[PDB]
Design a protein around this ligand. Structure first.
Ligand SMILES: O=C(O)CNC(=O)C(=O)O
Ligand SMILES: c1ccc2[nH]cnc2c1
Ligand code: NI
Ligand SMILES: [Zn+2]
Length: 331
């Protein structure tokens, strides 16, 4: 078996290899990339997402989210407090202000140390889940607004035609903005392009070991676990690399820089944080290998994990026994 230690792999496709998206994902998996839960893809030097980022300041962040932490430095939850709308230009200025800016640091590892030491004592503001794309319509390769849809994949594989759409989301981040431990909706793949700005550090658990992370989470967040059998779907729980190591949970880490893609694989738990002002674009996608993960995905029915209506068809077709209970939670 390829990549038996489940290391995060880094790929450098040629411009010829960058033409056929599906084919390259399949190639990465032939080399064992999926066993890590996360891969980095560095685009060919000839490629670009768009010409410049000089004219993005008028994009609106309708509902910026203030991420307020509770708990201890290495084990905490965060809740999202809604703030007043602001443009990306206003948000960038806020990110760079003395209150929110990245501190002096020696390197990525120094900044990582500072993040886990001090994150809970601040409440950074995030622009998340903003429907849109910053890819030029003329960018033909790895354009996250032009990918084959998950609905068409399900139809090609299983012959069922379903409603729903599949479009990208923008994320504007600042120092200490945080994404909690989670897998994707329906344990789908995701792909994330860092368009502009400071890095994003990722943590990931191999899919074959996801249940180990779930068991630790139940132990560390006991009230949440009693409330919901799939509470990581709520996307509010953080556990530090130090605490993961103390509990023998297998994981890896890597830092994504501007101009790089990351792919997360079905049932690969991931979490992370932003180093400073940045902008990323991400979308879910599927392959034939995903279908069995979609069938087995654990669902939240307690009401906290409200999601887009396009997930309805996924649960309805792949998980008909679970559908009634899940749908009640979406109401
Ligand atoms: O970048 C973020 O804030 C979160 N992104 C993801 O979880 C992803 O791309 O799957
Ligand atoms: C299913 C379909 C589209 C989606 N967009 C975000 N999550 C999704 C799940
Ligand atoms: Ni994700
Ligand atoms: Zn729940």
């Amino acid at each position: 078996a390829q990549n038996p230690n489940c290391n995060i792999m880094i790929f450098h496709p040629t411009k010829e290899e960058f033409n056929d998206f599906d084919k390259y994902i399949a190639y990465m998996e032939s080399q064992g990339a999926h066993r890590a839960g996360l891969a980095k893809i560095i685009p060919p030097k000839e490629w670009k997402a768009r010409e410049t980022y000089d004219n993005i300041s008028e994009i609106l962040i309708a509902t910026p989210l203030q991420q307020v932490a509770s708990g201890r430095a290495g084990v905490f939850t965060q809740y999202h407090k809604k703030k007043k709308a602001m443009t990306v230009g206003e948000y960038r200025h806020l990110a760079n202000s003395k209150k929110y800016q990245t501190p002096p640091h020696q390197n990525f590892e120094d900044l990582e140390r500072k993040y886990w030491k001090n994150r809970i004592y601040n409440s950074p503001i995030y622009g998340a889940d903003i429907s849109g794309s910053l890819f030029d319509e003329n960018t033909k390769q790895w354009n996250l607004g032009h990918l084959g849809t998950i609905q068409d994949l399900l139809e090609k594989e299983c012959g069922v035609v379903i409603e729903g759409v599949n479009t990208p989301y923008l994320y504007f981040g600042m120092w200490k903005t945080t994404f909690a431990w989670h897998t994707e909706d329906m344990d789908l793949y995701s792909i994330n392009y860092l368009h502009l700005g400071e890095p994003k550090t990722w943590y990931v658990v191999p899919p074959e070991h996801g249940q180990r992370l779930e068991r630790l989470a139940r132990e560390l967040f006991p009230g949440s676990s009693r409330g919901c059998g799939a509470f990581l779907r709520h996307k509010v729980a953080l556990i530090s690399p130090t605490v993961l190591k103390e509990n023998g949970i297998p994981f890896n880490r890597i830092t994504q820089e501007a101009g790089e893609f990351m792919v997360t694989f079905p049932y690969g738990y991931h979490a992370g944080f932003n180093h400073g002002f940045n902008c990323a674009e991400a979308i879910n996608f599927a392959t034939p290998r995903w279908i069995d993960y979609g069938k087995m995905a654990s669902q939240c029915s307690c009401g906290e994990a409200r999601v887009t209506f396009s997930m309805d068809a996924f649960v309805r077709i792949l998980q008909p026994e679970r559908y009634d209970l899940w749908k009640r939670g979406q109401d």
